[PDB]
C-alpha cells in the first residue's frame, strides 16, 4: 500500500486477553498441583503439554476450540469440542484409540468427552 495509508473471527478464549483469566475466562486445565502445599505441579504441566500436542495431532482440523483437561483423583477427563465434518465412525475409532494410548501412557483411567458443533462458535471479530 502506501506508508500513511496504513496509518478475523475469534472465539471467547481467543478474544479475551490473558489478564482476564480469572475475571472473564477460566482455566483450561483444572488440578490440585498449583494449590498451596500440593506437589507435582510441573509433572501435571508436562502431562498437559503432551495431551494437548497429542490431541491436536490425532484430531487434525476437528477440534473447534481448545481442550479442557480435568483431573479428579487419578481420573483424567479430556473434554474436547470438535466439528461435525469427520464421520462418526472415525470419531469412535479415534476416541477408543486415544483413550487406550493415554491410559497406558499415563497409567491412569483416561476418558474422553467429545462435543461436536456445526462450526466454530465465533465470539467477535478482531
Amino acid at each position: 500500500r502506501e506508508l500513511p495509508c496504513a496509518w478475523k473471527p475469534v472465539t471467547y478464549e481467543e478474544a479475551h486477553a490473558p489478564h482476564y483469566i480469572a475475571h472473564r475466562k477460566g482455566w483450561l486445565s483444572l488440578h490440585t498441583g498449583n494449590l498451596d502445599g500440593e506437589d507435582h505441579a510441573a509433572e501435571r504441566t508436562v502431562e498437559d503439554v503432551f495431551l494437548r500436542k497429542f490431541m491436536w495431532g490425532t484430531f487434525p482440523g476437528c477440534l473447534a476450540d481448545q481442550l479442557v483437561l480435568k483431573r479428579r483423583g487419578n481420573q483424567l477427563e479430556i473434554c474436547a469440542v470438535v466439528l461435525r465434518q469427520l464421520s462418526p465412525h472415525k470419531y469412535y475409532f479415534l476416541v477408543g484409540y486415544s483413550e487406550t494410548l493415554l491410559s497406558y501412557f499415563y497409567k491412569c483411567p483416561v476418558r474422553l468427552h467429545l462435543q461436536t458443533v456445526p462450526s466454530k462458535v465465533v465470539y467477535k471479530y478482531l
Binding site: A22, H23, R24, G26
Partner: protein, 292 residues
C-alpha cells in the same frame, strides 16, 4: 436483530427451564422465583469469576434482549399517542402535563433526577437543553403551593440522598445494683481500645484498670486529655469514671479513654451540649492509623 417470534420462543423456553430447575432443586415450581433461580444456578454452576456478569445466569428473556422496540402504531397505521409526530411523545407529554398543572395552580436532603436516568424512565433520548427546560418547569411547580398530588408528582422525579449528621447515639442510662445511674461506652484510638462507665453523680474520681488516673498516667499530657471532655462542658468533679483500656501505647490509650468518656458523658448533658462536643471534635473516632 431479534424477531418477535424468536423472543416468544425464548419466553416459552425460559418457562420450561424454570419448571425444570424447580424440579432439580426439589422446590415447588408454582412458587419458584427469580432469586431462587439465581441461587440454584450459583449452586449448580459454581463460578468465581470476579466479573459479576461473566458468571452463568438464567434471566427472563426480556431482561436479556433489548425490548425497547415497542410499536407506536397499530395495523391501521394510526399512532397511539396524540404527540407521536413530535418524535418525543413521552417527553413532550410530560411537559404538557407539567404545564397544565402549573396553569391549575395559577388559577388557584434530595436531588434532582439526572439526565440519563430521566432518559431511562422516558425510554427516549433527549438533549441537555430540553432536560434543563423540564427541570426549570419542575422548579416552578415546587415554588408554587403544590398540593399532595403535585408533591408526589415531583417526588416521582426527585431522588433520595440521606443526610444523618448532628445525631450522636445517646447511650441508655442504666442503673447498677446500688441504684446508681451510669452509662457505658467504647472508644478506639490506633490499636488502643477503651471502655468507660460514667456515673451520673460522683466526686471526680477516674479509675483506669483499677488504678487512679494520676498513677496510671504519669505524663501530664494524658491527664489533660482525660480532663478535656469534662472541662469542656463545665462538670469537673461531678462524675465518677471507671474505665478499662487495653492495647496501644500511652497517648493512644489516653485518646481512647477520652473518646469513651465523651461518648458515655453524652447521656448526662443537654442536646445542645452534645452538639457542642460533636463540633469540638470530642465525639469523632480518629481514623488516622499507620499506613503500610
Amino acid at each position: 436483530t431479534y424477531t418477535e417470534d424468536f423472543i416468544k420462543k425464548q419466553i416459552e423456553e425460559f418457562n420450561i427451564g424454570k419448571r425444570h430447575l424447580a424440579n432439580m432443586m426439589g422446590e415447588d415450581p408454582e412458587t419458584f422465583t427469580q432469586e431462587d433461580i439465581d441461587r440454584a444456578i450459583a449452586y449448580l454452576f459454581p463460578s468465581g469469576l470476579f466479573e459479576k456478569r461473566a458468571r452463568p445466569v438464567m434471566k427472563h428473556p426480556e431482561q436479556i434482549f433489548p425490548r425497547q422496540r415497542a410499536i407506536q402504531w397499530g395495523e391501521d397505521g394510526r399512532p397511539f399517542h396524540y404527540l407521536f409526530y413530535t418524535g418525543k411523545q413521552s417527553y413532550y407529554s410530560l411537559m404538557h402535563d407539567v404545564y397544565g398543572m402549573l396553569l391549575n395552580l395559577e388559577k388557584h436532603g434530595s436531588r434532582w433526577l439526572i439526565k440519563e436516568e430521566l432518559e431511562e424512565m422516558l425510554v427516549e433520548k433527549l438533549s441537555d437543553l430540553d432536560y434543563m427546560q423540564f427541570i426549570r418547569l419542575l422548579e416552578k411547580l415546587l415554588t408554587s403551593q403544590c398540593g399532595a398530588a403535585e408533591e408526589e408528582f415531583v417526588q416521582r422525579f426527585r431522588r433520595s440522598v440521606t443526610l444523618e449528621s448532628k445525631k450522636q447515639l445517646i447511650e441508655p442510662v442504666q442503673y447498677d445494683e446500688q441504684g446508681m445511674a451510669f452509662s457505658k461506652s467504647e472508644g478506639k484510638r490506633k490499636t488502643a481500645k477503651a471502655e468507660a462507665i460514667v456515673y451520673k453523680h460522683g466526686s471526680g474520681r477516674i479509675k483506669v484498670n483499677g488504678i487512679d488516673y494520676q498513677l496510671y498516667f504519669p505524663i501530664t499530657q494524658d491527664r489533660e486529655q482525660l480532663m478535656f471532655p469534662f472541662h469542656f462542658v463545665d462538670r469537673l468533679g461531678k462524675h465518677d469514671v471507671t474505665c478499662t483500656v487495653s492495647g496501644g501505647g500511652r497517648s493512644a490509650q489516653a485518646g481512647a479513654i477520652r473518646l469513651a468518656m465523651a461518648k458515655a458523658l453524652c447521656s448526662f448533658v443537654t442536646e445542645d451540649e452534645v452538639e457542642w462536643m460533636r463540633q469540638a471534635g470530642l465525639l469523632t473516632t480518629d481514623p488516622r492509623v499507620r499506613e503500610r
